[PDB]
Amino acid sequence: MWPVDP
Amino acid sequence: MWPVDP
Amino acid sequence: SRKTYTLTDYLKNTYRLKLYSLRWISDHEYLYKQENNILVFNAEYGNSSVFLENSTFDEFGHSINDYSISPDGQFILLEYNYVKQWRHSYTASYDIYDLNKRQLITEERIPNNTQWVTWSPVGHKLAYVWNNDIYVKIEPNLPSYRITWTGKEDIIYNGITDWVYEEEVFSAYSALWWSPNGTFLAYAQFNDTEVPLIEYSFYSDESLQYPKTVRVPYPKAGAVNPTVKFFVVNTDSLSSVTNATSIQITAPASMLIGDHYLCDVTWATQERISLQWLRRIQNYSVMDICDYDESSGRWNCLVARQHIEMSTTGWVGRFRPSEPHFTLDGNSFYKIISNEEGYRHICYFQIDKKDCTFITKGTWEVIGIEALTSDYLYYISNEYKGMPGGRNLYKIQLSDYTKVTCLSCELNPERCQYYSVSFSKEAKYYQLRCSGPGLPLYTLHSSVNDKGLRVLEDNSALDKMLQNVQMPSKKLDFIILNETKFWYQMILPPHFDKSKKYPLLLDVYAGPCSQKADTVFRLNWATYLASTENIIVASFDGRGSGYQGDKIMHAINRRLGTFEVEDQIEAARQFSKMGFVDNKRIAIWGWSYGGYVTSMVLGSGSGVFKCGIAVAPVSRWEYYDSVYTERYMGLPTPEDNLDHYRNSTVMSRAENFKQVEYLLIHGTADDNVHFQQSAQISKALVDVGVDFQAMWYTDEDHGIASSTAHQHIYTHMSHFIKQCFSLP
Amino acid sequence: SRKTYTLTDYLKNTYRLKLYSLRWISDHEYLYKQENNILVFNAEYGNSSVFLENSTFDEFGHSINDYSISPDGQFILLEYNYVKQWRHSYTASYDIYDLNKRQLITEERIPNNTQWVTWSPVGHKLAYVWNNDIYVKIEPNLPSYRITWTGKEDIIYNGITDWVYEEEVFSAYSALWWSPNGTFLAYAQFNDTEVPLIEYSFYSDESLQYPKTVRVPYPKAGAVNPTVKFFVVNTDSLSSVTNATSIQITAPASMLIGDHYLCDVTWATQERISLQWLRRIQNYSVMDICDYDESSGRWNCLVARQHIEMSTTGWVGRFRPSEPHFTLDGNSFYKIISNEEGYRHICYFQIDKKDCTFITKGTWEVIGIEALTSDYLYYISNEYKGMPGGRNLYKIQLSDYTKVTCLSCELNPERCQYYSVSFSKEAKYYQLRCSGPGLPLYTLHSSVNDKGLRVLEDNSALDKMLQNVQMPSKKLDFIILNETKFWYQMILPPHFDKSKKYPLLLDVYAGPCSQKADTVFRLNWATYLASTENIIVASFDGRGSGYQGDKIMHAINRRLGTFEVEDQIEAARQFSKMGFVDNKRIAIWGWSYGGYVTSMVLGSGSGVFKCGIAVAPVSRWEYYDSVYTERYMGLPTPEDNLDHYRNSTVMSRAENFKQVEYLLIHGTADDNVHFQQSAQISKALVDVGVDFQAMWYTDEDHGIASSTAHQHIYTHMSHFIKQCFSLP
Ligand SMILES: *[C@@H]1O[C@H](CO[C@H]2O[C@@H](C)[C@@H](O)[C@@H](O)[C@@H]2O)[C@@H](O[C@@H]2O[C@H](CO)[C@@H](O)[C@H](O)[C@H]2NC(C)=O)[C@H](O)[C@H]1NC(C)=O
Ligand SMILES: *[C@@H]1O[C@H](CO)[C@@H](O[C@@H]2O[C@H](CO)[C@@H](O)[C@H](O)[C@H]2NC(C)=O)[C@H](O)[C@H]1NC(C)=O
Ligand SMILES: *[C@@H]1O[C@H](CO)[C@@H](O[C@@H]2O[C@H](CO)[C@@H](O)[C@H](O)[C@H]2NC(C)=O)[C@H](O)[C@H]1NC(C)=O
Ligand SMILES: *[C@@H]1O[C@H](CO)[C@@H](O[C@@H]2O[C@H](CO)[C@@H](O)[C@H](O)[C@H]2NC(C)=O)[C@H](O)[C@H]1NC(C)=O
Ligand SMILES: *[C@@H]1O[C@H](CO)[C@@H](O[C@@H]2O[C@H](CO)[C@@H](O)[C@H](O)[C@H]2NC(C)=O)[C@H](O)[C@H]1NC(C)=O
Ligand SMILES: *[C@@H]1O[C@H](CO)[C@@H](O[C@@H]2O[C@H](CO)[C@@H](O)[C@H](O)[C@H]2NC(C)=O)[C@H](O)[C@H]1NC(C)=O
Ligand SMILES: *[C@@H]1O[C@H](CO[C@H]2O[C@@H](C)[C@@H](O)[C@@H](O)[C@@H]2O)[C@@H](O)[C@H](O)[C@H]1NC(C)=O
Ligand SMILES: *C1O[C@H](CO)[C@@H](O)[C@H](O)[C@H]1NC(C)=O
Ligand SMILES: *[C@@H]1O[C@@H](CO)[C@@H](O)[C@H](O)[C@H]1NC(C)=O
Ligand SMILES: *[C@@H]1O[C@H](CO)[C@@H](O)[C@H](O)[C@H]1NC(C)=O
Ligand SMILES: *[C@@H]1O[C@H](CO)[C@@H](O)[C@H](O)[C@H]1NC(C)=O
Ligand SMILES: *[C@@H]1O[C@H](CO)[C@@H](O)[C@H](O)[C@H]1NC(C)=O
Ligand SMILES: *[C@@H]1O[C@H](CO)[C@@H](O)[C@H](O)[C@H]1NC(C)=O
Ligand SMILES: *[C@@H]1O[C@H](CO)[C@@H](O)[C@H](O)[C@H]1NC(C)=O
Fold first, then answer.
1. Rounded to whole angstroms, how far apart are CA atoms D633 and D557?
2. How would you classify the pairing of strands D376-381 and D392-397?
3. Are C552 and C567 spatial neighbours (Cβ–Cβ below 8 Å)?
4. Is C495 an active-site residue?
5. Is the domain of D40 the same as that of D64?
6. Which of C168, D35, D226, D338 is the 20 to 30 A CA-CA neighbour of D406?
7. Do C291 and C170 share a structural domain?
8. What angle, 0 to 180 degrees and rounded to 10, lies between the N-to-C axes of helices C593-602 and C563-576?
């Protein structure tokens, strides 16, 4: 579970 | 395959 | 200027139609359920006795789902723990109750999770299926005899159909057939060993941590089909000391040379049975007729009583070959076959004679054969006033074929143009059901006279309620294309003023041999849309549709998703040309095949339509089941019809969707038109950059029929249409 | 009054940021790729030689995906046939090329479908994983030695992580570790034998007749976890006549009494290795330190050199325990641990001494340790100007802990407040990356002086392009609740006039230790929404967020979906109270955890929000994976925390959704946040009669990142928000 990434 | 019906 | 038929009136079902479901038990008596008491009525006089009371089963312990009474009146079967499977399949628990000694049979009982039960046609013999094997009880209280030992889940089916036989051929779960007096039990065996599995997730209550994978044997088009075998067993000679002997009836060598289907079985006499087999390529079929051979103990079918049936314009039968209706002695039979100019009429065969004689002709079709006496044949046709969408009872004098009488045409010609019929045990009496265009109307008659006895139900109760509300009206008429008439219907808003511009919804199905334009009375979503929203809801029976003879029906053979879709777009044009239609507010919607057509139409780039709604659409025929798909398209191989399979997908038209507003809906647990189909459409549209909305329904199947889902979908669609039509 | 940042500018990516990806190869040299030529640069002088040309591989035959150059410069590894798996896993085919004899190695090659490859840290030794087993090549052209023989698909993983170890613990596919000079190869083995399977359908190209069922070992919360073992092997003594020997290192005994995880491995010296184990209940962890035992050939961990780490306010580490940074001799190390008042600072341990000394303190946290010389430790913290959302490089004199120098704070304080760093082989040089709030800026420095050498890249190219367009501005500030400051950020439309009423979108993530309010420069969907649509896009770091010490982070322990969700609603109120916000046009949206929060907020019935969009939301923690979920919630049992699992679902709030417009989106091939989660929400809302729209994405996963899908979703969302905000 990790942030929506750039 | 047949028509359905309420 | 009162109130309208609202969405809640539909969804909450505030306006109920009344029925009159009777079950004939003799020549002159029938049963009818009323305020929870089964009564027996005397056909002649109309007087009635109480047969069994709602008291009886107050302390049964369980909620009773359905009754079923042995022919000989002595016992009554009780169904509980109903758990639905597919269209007609389910499982249940069962209890038998002895009506003489007013009690429940407590020992040697039927197992929980029984898949099918049936009484014998006379007496109180029982046959049931449990864990895919057949069992027989001669007496309710005695132990049951095991008939088959090969039954195996998802592999071997003894006495019940697999998925594709249930849905596409027999229209039943049951694959067993008693002989008339109950001596013999015939049954089919389906072997699904190499039939591929369809698999999909099932989520269940939120309490279920890991989702379940439902997996089902299901042959998609061109894939590997089940195989079948047919046995007959003798129930009189059952041992309890020996396994019971089943006599196989192999099948026509003309069928054994390749893939085939068993598609009709009909008992003719106490010792004569008729089977109809059909080739995987469904334009050649064969009827066998078999006699019990007292010496050998076997069944023998002479090749000189065999009977072939074939086509070159298309497939055999409307959906499958018709069923024979034999005479008492069983040496001749009547059967609905298609004639020289392609109209379906009654033929008269001798069991050992290749040639038959037609006993009806005309530019119309027989719908079905309903009864046979020694000198009268009763049947249903769409002949009256040359309208295919109407339905009436007729009798024909056997000794004189020009002596045809219409039994229902003038009984009430303004209210009643769609009849169906239920006959008594020896055609001594008969009940008519009239289902349109007026409110349904059930009457009762004696056959001796064709004399109308009493009115059974007339929905006058409902009729009071309905003048309080502004109903829509139904037009039924036709248009002409290339000098053939094609019928259509329209649901018109109340106070329809033929010089205003109404917005129009085209309600489509359009599958082979379908008919959406008829005289039936219906209270449905269209009723709400016309009454409350002033939308004209239309349906058109173009090419491929049935009951108008083979030239119209077979016009799409090997060629699905071409003509029937064009003709829907054509009819739409003709409708706007009628002037009372808002040219720039035309929608289209359908379910199943109807969803496919809808989708193909919106994908056609014809500019006629602003928007559409496709519910559980087929998207490419290779995904749909084999029995159905191949009936019309053959196999998807290069040597056969693969080109037309590829040429006819929804996803090939993704690009043209840029010009319409699309709504896609599909249940995730659809075992019929698999979710796969819609999932593939959506992907195709995304890849081409087209906007639309999808909407899934968790764990709903092809019906989207669960209580809360049904409400939710019709709501979601209504809002979508209103918005697309700029309605308030 | 020029043009704005449009949706196409985002989706088609018309405004590109430039990077400067260098890969250090020595003390003073690095590699950089320039219009397809790898060049080597001299750190001191900036002059550069061509290392390898784009010509070389014109006729390779295959499309080359990625390079990788052996430490000793002699060989170059080529990756093709890349095929993605999960977040970091994939498979590929590989070719080695000898830079001396200008040629491809043609024999004893690496297999197609290799799962991981790595060079040794010095020289040209190779280790790779193929079919779940480990292999070693001492020389590129010689045959490879097989190390493990137990590898088995979806069961035994040798040298690579399973699903949950990849995603939740190591953040890598690779589970093998070379010793510094390359003598030893350490590796982990994961046994998934009893780990339940998650299963979901995959549809593929429309050409695929039957859908595929992907099935994956995945432990949901409370379920059965994998198990692990750890080995070290000696590569110098490899036989080719005997199977290799792998020495096990057992977990500590404190671990053994129950479920546990291997969560860090760090080599300390040529013959010393450190491991960190963690209990399934993640508030107790243990570091071991092992020496090679020459006499006996095994490894030796003295319980005297053990090291415990525990918590009572929450869990150990930000996400997992920190990693040690040893000194050259390997008898002491520095490690970021949480201090007395709950701030994360650098501690200094002796390998055989329970107690450490903190070398930094303050009301701020060390983000990470970046380099270690004999008398300087370089690190990154959020100390500068007391803002947690900012990031700067610092060095601390080892001999004197009060001698702290800031290396980046004043280099360019207006453009640059978010630094990260890449050091040379012995910290002789270092590259800074500044990523906000100005356009990214890469410079280069020498450590001897802290002297800035040259500017490597400054995006002035992009800067011309950008004044032609009306960009938004970013405010970063805080509010106060209960006398603690909580930070927030806002993307403000161009010419933002603080006395107008703008509509507001709250952009949420909010998971434990997250931080959505920072100084980074971003060109994303929010940029479009502010610039072209005049929407204020805000984010708030409330309770649970990190980098602000443990009192704020651990406030949600055992209690997920309570505080962090309330605080998002609170921040929303405070924002409308600021006056420049349209009170009745507030939305909220998020992805993953953010989708869960969004959903819980909309479900709260607070009336603050008009609508929301949840993308791939968690819906109830029992569905999500164990390593993550339990870290915060413990086990879902009655004796533990099951009450809070049940109390915290989205479906329990279905009823309150009647007051909002909801948009639910989920990819059908999500292996992370399974489709199950959204499917269960949708059902709950349907059963309660709430309207909303769903939207699935066929075969998309947790990224919804495929080219056409990415475009489609952002389009579909944009339209939804515009419509909900009444924007034309
Ligand atoms: C980039 O150039 C260097 C060194 O050349 C520099 O020497 C400085 C003292 C200074 O005057 C500066 O302006 C001048 O350009 C290369 O160094 C090379 O290293 C080896 C050692 O024998 C040899 O290959 C070169 O002859 C040697 N040059 C010198 C004069 O020492 C360096 O290799 C080059 N870097 C790259 C790889 O681009
Ligand atoms: C119903 O089934 C069978 C067949 O019609 C009847 O039993 C047969 O009776 C004939 C003529 O009397 C005998 O020669 C045979 O032995 C019987 N047939 C077989 C093959 O069993 C029976 O009479 C009918 N049912 C009843 C009980 O009336
Ligand atoms: C049923 O259909 C088949 C296939 O549609 C018919 O055979 C086709 O018709 C003619 C003569 O056989 C040929 O031009 C085609 O090549 C045949 N098609 C193929 C490939 O089978 C047949 O006439 C029909 N009835 C049967 C099988 O008796
Ligand atoms: C990897 O897989 C490919 C795919 O089939 C194999 O390809 C064959 O062998 C050579 C390898 O140099 C290819 O260029 C040819 O295209 C293939 N021959 C055919 C199909 O005619 C290949 O050998 C495999 N490579 C390795 C590393 O073993
Ligand atoms: C890398 O490190 C290891 C540290 O052990 C070195 O291995 C030892 O080297 C010496 C001399 O070659 C031997 O006598 C020992 O027996 C080795 N240890 C074992 C058993 O492997 C290795 O030499 C180092 N590489 C270097 C510095 O070249
Ligand atoms: C690890 O965490 C747990 C829960 O945070 C701590 O708690 C024990 O939890 C159980 C179950 O609720 C109670 O019966 C005990 O009273 C708790 N004991 C304590 C110490 O509070 C557990 O103690 C923590 N352990 C460590 C090593 O930090
Ligand atoms: C119904 O009545 C039968 C009694 O005979 C007379 O019934 C009158 C109602 C009348 O119409 C007369 O013509 C009849 O002759 C009786 O024998 C039937 O069995 C009864 N049927 C039931 C089910 O009660
Ligand atoms: C008329 O027939 C069809 C409709 O049945 C129509 O599509 C077609 O273009 C017309 N012409 C002919 C003779 O095919
Ligand atoms: C070494 O590996 C074994 C795995 O247990 C055997 O399968 C294999 O036969 C053995 N071979 C050698 C090289 O000794
Ligand atoms: C039983 O039947 C009578 C009708 O004669 C009726 O009054 C009563 O409602 C019925 N009971 C049930 C089960 O509804
Ligand atoms: C079916 O299930 C019930 C549950 O109590 C059980 O008691 C009963 O024995 C079962 N009935 C039969 C017919 O076996
Ligand atoms: C009958 O059925 C099967 C044979 O297929 C066998 O296992 C069983 O023993 C047989 N028993 C009887 C009742 O004759
Ligand atoms: C490849 O390499 C040369 C070497 O400088 C360069 O000039 C040329 O433009 C490059 N071409 C591309 C785009 O590969
Ligand atoms: C203050 O504490 C927290 C916010 O951090 C919250 O639970 C509580 O509701 C607040 N209320 C007041 C007025 O103290």
1. 7
2. antiparallel
3. no
4. no
5. yes
6. D338
7. yes
8. 70
Residue matched to tokens 């959204």: D678
- The torsion angle over the Cα atoms of residues C106, C112, C117 and C119, rounded to 10 degrees, is 0
Question: CB of C240 closer than 6 A to ligand 12?
Answer: no
- In DSSP notation, D150-173 reads --BTTTEEESB--HHIIIIIISSS
Instruction: Verify that D618 and D562 share a domain, yes or no.
Output: yes
- Chains in contact with D, where contact means 3 or more Cβ–Cβ distances below 8 Å, are A, C
Tell the residue nearest (CA) to atom 4 of ligand 4: D112
CATH of the domain at C180: 2.140.10.30
Q: Kindly state the tokens that stand for C88.
A: 């007609």
- Shared-domain flag, residues C378 and C510: no
Tokens of C111: 């197992």
* Residue finishing a domain among D401, D430, D459: D459
Cβ atoms of D363 and D386 within 8 Å: the answer is yes
The beta-strand segments (E) located in D688-727 are 693-697
Q: Which of C414, C434, C459 is the last residue of a domain?
A: C459
Asked whether the beta carbons of residue B1 and residue C705 sit closer than 8 angstroms, the reply is no
Q: Is C43 within 8 Å of C28 (Cβ atoms)?
A: yes
Q: Number of C-alpha atoms within 13 angstroms, CB side, residue C150?
A: 14
Beta strands in D373-495 (DSSP E): 376-381, 392-397, 404-406, 419-423, 429-434, 441-446, 451-457, 469-470, 473-481, 484-492
Burial class of residue C358 in the structure, from the number of CB atoms within 10 Å of its CB (0-12 exposed, 13-18 middle, 19+ buried):
middle
Nearest residue to C490 (alpha-carbon basis) of C479, C513, C469, C506: C506
Q: Rounded to whole angstroms, what are the CA distances from D301 to C515, D255, D275, D286, D708?
A: 83, 15, 10, 12, 53
Nearest CA in chain C to D621: C209
Q: Which helix (DSSP H) or strand (DSSP E) does residue C600 occupy?
A: helix C593-602
Q: What's the CA gap between C685 and D208, in Å, rounded?
A: 18
- Residues D159, D223, single domain; the answer is yes
Active-site annotation holder among D541, D670, D671, D701: D670
Q: How many C-alpha atoms does D20 have within 13 Å on its Cβ side?
A: 21
Could you say which of D514, D624, D673 has the minimum Cβ distance to residue A3?
Answer: D514
Catalytic residue among D120, D144, D338, D592: D592
Q: Locate tokens 């007026």: which residue?
A: C438
Residues C485, C407 within the same domain: no
- Cβ pair B1:C511 closer than 8 A: yes
Instruction: Please state the domain count of chain D.
Output: 2
User: CB–CB of D203 and C686 under 8 A?
Assistant: no
The residues on C that touch B, with CB distances below 8 Å, are 87, 167-168, 509, 511, 514, 524-525, 591-594, 618, 624-625, 628, 672-673, 702-703, 705, 710
The 8-class DSSP code of residue C9 comes to: I
* Whether residue C482 has its Cβ less than 6 Å from ligand 8: yes
Alpha-carbon span C331 to C346, nearest angstrom = 17
Asked if D696 has any chain C CB less than 8 Å from its own CB, the reply is: yes
Nearest residue by C-alpha to atom 10 in ligand 1: D45
Q: Which two tokens stand for residue C465?
A: 């309620």
Number of H helices, E strands in chain B: 0, 0
Tell me the three state secondary structure of residue D682. helix
> Resolution of the experimental model in angstroms, please?
3.2
Residues C75 and C9 in one domain: no
What letter does residue C243 receive in the DSSP assignment?
P
* Interchain pair A4, D594: CB under 8 A: yes
Does D192 qualify as catalytic in the annotation? no
Inspect the interface and report whether the beta carbons of D624 and A1 lie closer than 8 Å.
Answer: yes
Experimental method: X-ray
Sign of the alpha-carbon dihedral angle for D43, D44, D46, D47 = negative
C702 is catalytic: yes
Same domain, C443 and C490: no
Structural domain boundaries enclosing D694: 1-13+468-728
CA D93/CA C435 separation, integer angstroms? 70
CATH number at C660 reads 3.40.50.1820
